[PDB]
């Protein structure tokens, strides 16, 4: 039981270290997709506006 409980606590700790590291990597990868999408939405709205303005 001494070895079993000690080994269970260590196993959760690395599983938690790796889980946190995967999550933080996914946050930077997702964050860049949001910034590329945000800059495209602001270049579409300005081209539709200017396309109507040039016609009139």
């Amino acid at each position: 039981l001494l070895d079993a409980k000690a080994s269970e606590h260590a196993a959760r700790m690395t599983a938690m270290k790796n889980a946190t590291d995967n999550a933080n990597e996914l946050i930077r990868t997702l964050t860049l997709s949001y910034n590329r999408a945000r800059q495209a939405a602001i270049t579409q709205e300005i081209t539709e506006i200017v396309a109507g303005a040039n016609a009139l």
Binding site: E45, E48, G52, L56
Partner: protein, 470 residues
């Protein structure tokens, strides 16, 4: 002094009045032509002045199709805005935008009074702002966003969410009791729902106390914009001169905002934001600031508002939120889970949820429910990735109660007799407070969760469970 057509640009038309006696903005014009030869088509048309251009020429928006229009025709100037029959003659009848009766019932006499559709709004010297609570019998509204008697009520939602199935439930409950006129203004709605409502009103007998203005999805844009104002002039006459209290039901006020866009480019306006008119706030304000309850008499006004692309951050809804007193937002995610009515219990708000306007016992229970459902929202992210067993006893007990609260906000309506078989229920307010208090205190937590779906009173939930075998 007559006029001549020069440009026909789809919905817009342009007219030159050579004499110099030009019309004025918002005036109405007549085109009556009998065909000279076989090639032509007979035309009868009304048009409204929008803009004065330079060369003695005026832009006009039509109230019927511009098919068969030929350059050089004749336009007669009435000299006034569109004029609508107002009086006891309106009651029990269906009319077009121009006050001509659509119904086969008969024809209005030319001796009748008519009033003009355009008028400045009521003033700070004579508006009023007392609060009372209007009972509806719908659990979500009666607890978390009580409708205020004499105040503006807004149902917001995207396509296919539950808005018209609420207006019909309020019409069963409020219409008969609330003695006084009711007006219905169907802006941009299907003609399969206009027919169904006429027969629903004929069955019950609400027709004698009602007047209806219908403009459906298939009309030219101009007719769809000026259908809101026609209903409003009738309700205004009943508020001011007769002095009876009145109800207004307006269906899809977004279709008013959308029509302006279609005609904006052909009028010569530059575009703004997400393809919207350079004058959105200004038109919404003019229409909405007339719909008020004055010192003379009260208009309760109930509206469906369409959220243009499932985006509540769009200009037309954002501009609309500034005008209401109570608002329920309908969400498709709830409609997917089958929780009807699909009302957001957090995003819905009212000016009547104040400790003195509803009572201390009511307010305590209402805010406590809103803490439970906000806690369930953040916790769902943790459950979705890590799993529910990982969490504490207090977190488990929140998820337990929040599931039951969210399903017990669903209800069996009489208009859902067609959609769900089961007949329907009316829950008085005192009962709703008792029951929600029991859920929060844990008394009924032994029962299985499926028993709380589409039931009206908590008594019923106990029996429904018995059938399951618990």
């Amino acid at each position: 002094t007559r006029g001549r057509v020069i440009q026909v640009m789809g919905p817009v038309v342009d007219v030159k009045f050579e004499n110099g006696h030009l019309p004025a903005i918002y005036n109405a014009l007549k085109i009556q032509h009998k065909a000279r030869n076989e090639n032509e088509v007979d035309i009868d048309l009304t048009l409204e002045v929008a803009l004065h251009l330079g060369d003695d020429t005026v832009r006009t928006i039509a109230m019927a199709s511009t098919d068969g229009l030929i350059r050089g025709m004749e336009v007669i100037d009435t000299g006034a805005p569109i004029s609508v029959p107002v009086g006891e003659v309106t009651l029990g009848r269906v009319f077009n935008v121009l006050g001509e009766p659509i119904d086969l019932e008969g024809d209005i006499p030319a001796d009748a009074r008519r009033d003009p559709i355009h008028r400045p709004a009521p003033k700070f010297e004579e508006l009023a702002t007392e609060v009372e609570i209007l009972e509806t019998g719908i659990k979500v509204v009666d607890l978390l966003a009580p409708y205020i008697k004499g105040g503006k009520i807004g149902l917001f939602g995207g396509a296919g969410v539950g808005k018209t199935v609420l207006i019909q439930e309020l019409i069963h409950n409020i219409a008969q009791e609330h003695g006084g006129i009711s007006v219905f203004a169907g802006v941009g709605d299907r003609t399969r729902e206009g027919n169904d409502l006429y027969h629903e009103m004929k069955d019950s007998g609400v027709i004698s106390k009602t007047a209806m203005v219908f403009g459906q999805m298939n009309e030219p844009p101009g007719a769809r914009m000026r259908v809101a104002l026609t209903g409003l002039t009738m309700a205004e006459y009943f508020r001011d001169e007769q002095g009876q209290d009145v109800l207004l039901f307006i269906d899809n006020i977004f279709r008013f905002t959308q029509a302006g866009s279609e005609v904006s480019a052909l009028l010569g306006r530059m575009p703004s934001a997400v393809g919207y008119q350079p004058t959105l706030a200004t038109e919404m304000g003019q229409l909405q600031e007339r719909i008020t309850s004055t010192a003379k008499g009260s208009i309760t006004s109930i509206q469906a508002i369409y959220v243009p692309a499932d985006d509540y951050t769009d200009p037309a809804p954002a501009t609309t939120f500034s005008h209401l007193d109570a608002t329920t937002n309908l969400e498709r995610k709830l409609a997917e889970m089958g929780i009807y009515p699909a009302v957001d219990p957090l995003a819905s708000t009212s000016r009547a949820l104040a400790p003195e306007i509803v009572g201390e016992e009511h307010y305590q229970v209402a805010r406590k429910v809103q803490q439970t459902l906000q806690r369930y929202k953040e916790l769902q992210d943790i459950i979705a990735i890590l799993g529910m067993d990982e969490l504490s006893d207090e977190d488990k007990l929140v998820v337990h109660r929040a599931r039951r609260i969210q399903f017990f906000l669903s209800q069996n309506f009489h208009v859902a007799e067609q959609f769900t078989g089961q007949p329907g229920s009316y829950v008085p307010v005192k009962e709703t407070v008792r029951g929600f208090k029991e859920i929060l205190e844990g008394k009924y937590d032994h029962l299985p969760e499926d028993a709380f779906r589409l039931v009206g009173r908590i008594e019923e939930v106990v029996e429904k469970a018995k059938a399951m075998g618990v």
